[PDB]
Amino acid sequence: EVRTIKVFTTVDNINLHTQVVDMSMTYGQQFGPTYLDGADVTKIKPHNSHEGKTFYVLPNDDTLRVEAFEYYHTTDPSFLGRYMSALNHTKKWKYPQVNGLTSIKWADNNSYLATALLTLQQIELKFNPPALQDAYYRARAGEAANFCALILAYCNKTVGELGDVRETMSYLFQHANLDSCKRVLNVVCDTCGQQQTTLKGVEAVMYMGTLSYEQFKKGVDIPCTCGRRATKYLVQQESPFVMMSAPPAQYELKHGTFTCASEYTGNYQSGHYKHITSKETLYCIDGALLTKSSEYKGPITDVFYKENSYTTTIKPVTHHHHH
Ligand SMILES: [Cl-]
Ligand SMILES: [Cl-]
Ligand code: NA
Ligand code: NA
Ligand code: NA
Ligand SMILES: [Zn+2]
């Protein structure tokens, strides 16, 4: 005798697909890789209690391939498996409210994700994939498991794997609407003259080499191809924030001069991230932990600043000689 139950399959947890499954065959024999709220049930046969429940599957048919792309903006074949695998862990993490923001209690080497999530709640950023829009809204309300699992999937990081905050933000920004962001730079060499460049989108809001926005406006020394040290400085900026990054180094964060920052203690193989936010005082959020101070000095790697529109008032030759 053939026994069956009705279940629903999905790739986006919105659009459902009715299935009649044979209770003598595993989900994998019938759907391929199958997950129940992150749990891998591929090798499990249907239970009575599964009737009417929704299972994630991989995009096997054309219908599912379109739904998955429209929701996630990826066609990487393993994406849904990686998201589900991560979700099985992140649904067990805790997301405490710390100083009015959703943080993450430490687990599974997740300090880089905690400071990324805290940072997002302090900068103006809109995501493009519906999956991130929906999950980020939930994360702001305090239910951040799906958002964290999506970050891991989009960044191709597994739970427990070491992550870099700058790289994680770069991926998040790649999936955000930054088309209104513009940056104009000028590079001045005594030998080679002046070279202006215009950057757009993610490249307009990220810079690697100095933590100081003020120093970037004054001028930073970089190598020129001729071998001399040229001066690079910010000509014009149109964006709601900027992110300045550098290899970790002792750095003083002054209250009221920045939005938030990330601190990395450790080395290239093992470390830990903390988050610093400048509000009525300086708050240091370390997952679930919170401390305060009037001054802060530590190995800072990333600093975020507010912006709207900036235009330099100084001529190039003045930046080259006075930075
Ligand atoms: Cl959004
Ligand atoms: Cl996108
Ligand atoms: Na935000
Ligand atoms: Na919130
Ligand atoms: Na974009
Ligand atoms: Zn030169």
Q: What is the CATH number of the domain that holds 35?
A: 3.10.20.540
| Ligand found nearest the CA of 121 | 3
Ligand 2 centroid from CA 173, angstroms: 9
With contact defined as beta carbons under 8 Å apart, do 91 and 37 qualify?
Answer: yes
Please check whether residues 308 and 188 belong to one and the same domain.
yes
∠ at Cα 145 (140, 146), nearest 5°?
90
Please check whether residues 158 and 270 belong to one and the same domain.
no
State the Cα–Cα distance between residues 61 and 267, nearest whole angstrom.
46
Ligand 2 centroid from CA 119, angstroms: 19
State the Cα–Cα distance between residues 253 and 87, nearest whole angstrom.
35
Give the determination technique: X-ray
Residue 81: inside a domain: no
Nearest of 95, 176, 94 to residue 133 by alpha carbon: 176
Helix axis angle, 79-90 to 62-72, nearest 10° = 60
Please check whether residues 245 and 286 belong to one and the same domain.
yes
271-278: strand order across its sheet: 206-208, 241-253, 296-306, 260-266, 271-278, 282-286, 289-293
Q: What is the CATH number of the domain that holds 302?
A: 2.60.120.1680
Dihedral angle of Cα 155, 156, 160, 161, to the nearest 10 degrees:
-90
Which of helix, strand or coil describes residue 145? helix
Of 18, 40, 58, the residue that ends a domain is 58
Name the domain count of the chain: 3
Ligand 6 centroid from CA 33, angstroms: 57
Ligand 5 centroid from CA 130, angstroms: 13
With contact defined as beta carbons under 8 Å apart, do 236 and 311 qualify?
Answer: yes
- For residue 296, what is the DSSP state? E
CA pseudo-torsion sign 59, 62, 64, 69: positive
| Ligand found nearest the CA of 128 | 2
Please check whether residues 159 and 195 belong to one and the same domain.
no
Residue 64: inside a domain: no
Ligand 5 centroid from CA 129, angstroms: 10
With contact defined as beta carbons under 8 Å apart, do 117 and 139 qualify?
Answer: yes
With contact defined as beta carbons under 8 Å apart, do 171 and 121 qualify?
Answer: no
Ligand 4 centroid from CA 101, angstroms: 6
Of 58, 73, 94, the residue that ends a domain is 58
Contacts 24+ apart (CB under 8 A), 149-153: 149/38, 149/83, 149/84, 149/86, 149/87, 149/89, 149/90, 149/91, 150/83, 150/86, 151/113, 151/116, 152/82, 152/83, 152/86, 152/90, 152/113, 153/79, 153/82, 153/83, 153/86
Please check whether residues 27 and 52 belong to one and the same domain.
yes
Please check whether residues 152 and 188 belong to one and the same domain.
no
Ligand 3 centroid from CA 140, angstroms: 9
Ligand 2 centroid from CA 6, angstroms: 34
| Ligand found nearest the CA of 191 | 6
Q: Which helix (H) or strand (E) holds 126?
A: none
Ligand 1 centroid from CA 23, angstroms: 40
Please check whether residues 188 and 169 belong to one and the same domain.
no
Please check whether residues 135 and 193 belong to one and the same domain.
no
Residue 232: inside a domain: yes
Q: Which helix (H) or strand (E) holds 189?
A: strand 182-189
Q: What is the CATH number of the domain that holds 167?
A: 1.10.8.1190
Please check whether residues 170 and 189 belong to one and the same domain.
no
Ligand 6 centroid from CA 186, angstroms: 13
Host domain of residue 9? 4-58
Helix axis angle, 145-155 to 130-140, nearest 10° = 140
| Ligand found nearest the CA of 100 | 4
Please check whether residues 285 and 232 belong to one and the same domain.
yes
Residue 74: inside a domain: no
| Ligand found nearest the CA of 320 | 6
Please check whether residues 189 and 92 belong to one and the same domain.
no
What resolution, expressed in A, was reported for this entry? 1.8
CB atoms within 10 A of CB 143: 14
Ligand 5 centroid from CA 321, angstroms: 37
Residue 78: inside a domain: no
| Ligand found nearest the CA of 174 | 5
Ligand 5 centroid from CA 154, angstroms: 14
